[PDB]
Design a protein around this ligand. Sequence first.
Ligand SMILES: [Cl-]
Ligand SMILES: [Mn+2]
Ligand SMILES: [Y+3]
Ligand SMILES: [Y+3]
Ligand SMILES: [Y+3]
Ligand SMILES: [Y+3]
Length: 148
Amino acid sequence: LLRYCVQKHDASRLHYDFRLELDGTLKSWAVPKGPCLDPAVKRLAVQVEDHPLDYADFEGSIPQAGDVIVWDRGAWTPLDDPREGLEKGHLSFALDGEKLSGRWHLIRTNLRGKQSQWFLVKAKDGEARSLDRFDVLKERPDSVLSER
Ligand SMILES: [Cl-]
Ligand SMILES: [Mn+2]
Ligand SMILES: [Y+3]
Ligand SMILES: [Y+3]
Ligand SMILES: [Y+3]
Ligand SMILES: [Y+3]
């Protein structure tokens, strides 16, 4: 029911935009090194501007940016009150995507003036993979909407 997408955004700095639908908008974080299935790997995720739901399907070119593709898409569900979680700086959730699945955490720093800084972390479960054995970004690098 609630939409999720990850867009690979080839701007000045390559990054991945991670988006979760909540209350009619896409809550969004820029994750410069991309999501990681390894629970030991914490990935910087900088909260950015909410986006409209239909952007979840957008592929094309963004002026200053560069090319955008939809790298993963699906649904998400919170495992605890998502509104309270966003406010308090911890979202626990599960993903039902093409590439990403299983349980995840977004955790915000409590440091005053660094409130935009979160970390996306894979939770330990059947979908976790060690980074030295499987890097999801390398193994499955294509658009899920437009490949070939
Ligand atoms: Cl557990
Ligand atoms: Mn971006
Ligand atoms: Y509240
Ligand atoms: Y599939
Ligand atoms: Y392919
Ligand atoms: Y390719």
